[PDB]
Design an enzyme around this catalytic site. Structure first.
Site, short mmCIF file in Angstrom:
data_model
loop_
_atom_site.label_atom_id
_atom_site.label_comp_id
_atom_site.label_asym_id
_atom_site.label_seq_id
_atom_site.Cartn_x
_atom_site.Cartn_y
_atom_site.Cartn_z
CD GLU A 17 -44.77 19.91 20.76
OE1 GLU A 17 -45.57 20.06 20.58
OE2 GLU A 17 -44.14 21.07 20.25
CB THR A 22 -36.73 12.62 23.32
OG1 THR A 22 -37.67 12.68 22.15
CG2 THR A 22 -35.23 11.91 22.36
NE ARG A 159 -44.68 16.58 17.85
CZ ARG A 159 -44.77 17.96 17.06
NH1 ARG A 159 -43.35 19.45 17.69
NH2 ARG A 159 -46.53 18.13 16.01
CG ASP A 181 -42.13 8.91 28.94
OD1 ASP A 181 -41.89 10.48 29.73
OD2 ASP A 181 -42.22 9.07 28.01
CD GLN A 185 -49.99 19.00 24.34
OE1 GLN A 185 -51.10 17.99 24.02
NE2 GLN A 185 -49.20 19.19 22.81
N1 LIG Z 1 -32.90 19.10 18.72
C1 LIG Z 1 -33.18 18.08 19.13
N2 LIG Z 1 -34.40 17.84 19.98
C2 LIG Z 1 -35.37 17.04 20.53
C3 LIG Z 1 -34.37 17.38 21.38
N3 LIG Z 1 -34.62 16.01 22.90
C4 LIG Z 1 -36.12 15.89 22.33
N4 LIG Z 1 -36.74 16.86 21.26
C5 LIG Z 1 -37.70 16.41 20.57
O1 LIG Z 1 -38.15 17.08 20.32
C6 LIG Z 1 -40.59 16.63 20.18
C7 LIG Z 1 -40.35 16.44 21.59
O2 LIG Z 1 -40.16 15.55 21.98
P1 LIG Z 1 -40.54 14.78 23.35
O3 LIG Z 1 -38.94 13.21 24.04
O4 LIG Z 1 -41.90 13.66 22.73
O5 LIG Z 1 -41.03 15.35 24.50
P2 LIG Z 1 -42.23 14.93 25.31
O6 LIG Z 1 -41.71 15.62 26.77
O7 LIG Z 1 -41.67 13.53 25.97
O8 LIG Z 1 -43.64 15.58 24.91
P3 LIG Z 1 -44.85 15.18 25.92
O9 LIG Z 1 -45.38 13.63 25.64
O10 LIG Z 1 -45.15 15.51 27.21
S1 LIG Z 1 -46.70 16.07 24.51
C8 LIG Z 1 -39.17 15.03 19.76
O11 LIG Z 1 -39.47 15.58 18.93
C9 LIG Z 1 -38.30 14.58 19.75
O12 LIG Z 1 -37.50 14.13 18.56
C10 LIG Z 1 -33.29 17.96 21.55
O13 LIG Z 1 -32.37 17.19 23.40
N5 LIG Z 1 -32.77 18.42 20.46
MG LIG Z 2 -43.62 11.64 26.03
#
Ligand SMILES: Nc1nc2c(ncn2[C@@H]2O[C@H](COP(=O)(O)OP(=O)(O)OP(O)(O)=S)[C@@H](O)[C@H]2O)c(=O)[nH]1
Ligand SMILES: [Mg+2]
Ligand SMILES: [Cl-]
Length: 343
Positions: A17, A22, A159, A181, A185
């Protein structure tokens, strides 16, 4: 004289997360084509699933809080909101892709106005209530519309936990980046090591807003402590001896609101933080304190045969398209300048 083609491997790492996907979507938007209509519609089932997931976590948390409250009517829901509530938790549990209709949105929007749900949202950091919750709860009419088409904003919010390995290729403005990417987790990290060969730069995402939150994987573990320990672990990997480290201190937009309401001190790492001002002065004080913790962590864990590698920090909001564009240009100049140095 060879082919002239230089492909440089970039790797998104970071905890669950943290913003990796993103950032990944922003790269596609910036350096390739913008989402076409079909691609936008493909996220409707995700966005709709997110809405049911969010209201469920709120509905479940209320039940958890009520059991521990012995002399309070605080977390008792209304009758109508229970008739809506139970209906939705039924649907969301039997279907991976529950559809958001006009009628369902009506029930959710009503359930959102229940003071018991609001008392639950206020303690959201003790639950796995997502940050986008307010946003979703405020765009129901639009999202439940019969001919709903997601905006870029919607899609970036959308998400999904990443469970595979996805690659894109782009050249900014025979130099090509190959960007990967991967899920962050704990269980998805088993996949990491096989990606670690020949990496030009690791783009490590650290969600700095999570200092009062606990892990999906282990609700007793502080999220910022996991990020600390995970970054620490990445830095010691032998394959990364010469790899550049681009540290995205991400979710600054959330961090900005949170720091004036929740002291940094609730996280163990930031235990000794002392506030000095108010408003934007204080926010920047707090930011610089967090950044300094990460810098120190970096140097604490980088041995002499590795200390020459590039290391940069950027404050990011992954949802902000202009900021990701400007951030990626800085990263590219830095990587180019460095490769030109070792030649
Ligand atoms: N407000 C805000 N929300 C964010 C930001 N970066 C990511 N998010 C939100 O957080 C959530 C998780 O982001 P995501 O990009 O899916 O994380 P991830 O690192 O890919 O997660 P995973 O695949 O290892 S489980 C999404 O709903 C996304 O829109 C940010 O900089 N600001
Ligand atoms: Mg991801
Ligand atoms: Cl530089």
């Amino acid at each position: 004289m060879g082919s002239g083609i230089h492909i440089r491997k970039l790797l998104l790492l970071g905890a669950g997360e943290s913003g990796k996907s993103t950032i990944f979507k922003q790269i596609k938007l910036l350096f390739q084509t913008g989402f076409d209509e079909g691609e936008l519609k493909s996220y409707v089932p995700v966005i709709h699933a997110n809405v049911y997931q969010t209201i469920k976590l709120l509905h479940d948390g209320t039940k958890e809080f009520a059991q521990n409250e012995t002399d309070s009517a605080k977390y008792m829901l209304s009758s109508e909101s229970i008739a809506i509530g139970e209906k939705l938790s039924e649907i969301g549990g039997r279907l991976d892709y529950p559809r958001l209709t006009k009628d369902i949105a009506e029930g959710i929007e009503t359930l959102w106005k229940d003071p018991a749900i609001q008392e639950t949202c206020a303690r959201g950091n003790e639950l796995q209530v997502p940050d986008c919750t307010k946003y979703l709860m405020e765009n129901l009419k639009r999202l439940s519309d019969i001919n709903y088409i997601p905006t870029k904003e919607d899609v970036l919010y959308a998400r999904v936990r990443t469970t595979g390995v996805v690659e894109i290729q782009f050249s900014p403005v025979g130099e090509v980046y190959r960007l990967f990417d991967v899920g962050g987790q704990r269980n998805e990290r088993r996949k990491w090591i096989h990606l670690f060969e020949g990496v030009t730069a690791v783009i490590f995402c650290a969600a700095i807003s999570e200092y009062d939150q606990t892990l999906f994987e282990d609700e007793q573990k502080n999220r910022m402590m996991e990020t600390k320990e995970l970054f620490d672990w990445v830095l010691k990997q032998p394959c990364f001896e010469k790899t550049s480290f681009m540290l995205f201190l991400n979710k600054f937009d959330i961090f900005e609101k949170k720091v004036l309401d929740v002291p940094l001190n609730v996280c163990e790492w930031f235990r000794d933080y002392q506030p000095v001002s108010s408003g934007k002065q204080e926010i920047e004080h707090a930011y610089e304190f967090v950044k300094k913790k990460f810098e120190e962590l970096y140097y604490q864990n980088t041995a002499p045969d590795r200390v020459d590698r590039v290391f940069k920090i950027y404050r990011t909001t992954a949802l902000d398209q202009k900021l990701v564009k400007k951030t990626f240009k800085l990263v590219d100049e830095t990587l180019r300048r460095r490769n030109l140095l070792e030649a």
